[PDB]
Amino acid sequence: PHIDIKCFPRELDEQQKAALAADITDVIIRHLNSKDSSISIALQQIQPESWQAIWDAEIAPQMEALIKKPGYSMNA
Amino acid sequence: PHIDIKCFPRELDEQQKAALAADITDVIIRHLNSKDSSISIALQQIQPESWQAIWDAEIAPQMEALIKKPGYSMNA
Numbered sequence: 001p002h003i004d005i006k007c008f009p010r011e012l013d014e015q016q017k018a019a020l021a022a023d024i025t026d027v028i029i030r031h032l033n034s035k036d037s038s039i040s041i042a043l044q045q046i047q048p049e050s051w052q053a054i055w056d057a058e059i060a061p062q063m064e065a066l067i068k069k070p071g072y073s074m075n076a
Numbered sequence: 077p078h079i080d081i082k083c084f085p086r087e088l089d090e091q092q093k094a095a096l097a098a099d100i101t102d103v104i105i106r107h108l109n110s111k112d113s114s115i116s117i118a119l120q121q122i123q124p125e126s127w128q129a130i131w132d133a134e135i136a137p138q139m140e141a142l143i144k145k146p147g148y149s150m151n152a
Contacts, residue, residue, distance in 0.1 A: 020107040
């Protein structure tokens, strides 16, 4: 599995990045029956003014297929 | 944060997809100082013969930045 995490900018040191990756890894192993070697994880920082593009391409068009829908909306 | 999970196909019912979403949500809240309302999660099942496109567009180019690198290589 390949997991992509997009979020607003924040400072994460190497220890933080590795711990987040480890917690994500174990969740994926549990739910998808995956092996550790099959998992890759990306963390991409997105500036606030570029979040609309993420909403438009990834969130809004897939809304009822999302496994977790956003509590916020960019189309109010 | 918006989380995208790509994996080879598997039989997952709605309760199973919600349980995966809940565990991912906890991890994101605790590591990114996030809130339930800010989190959206997509799950996309990709047939094995279409994984090369994922390697080429998402995994390989980001190798320098991934927070968890894959345990396999598929450069073609």
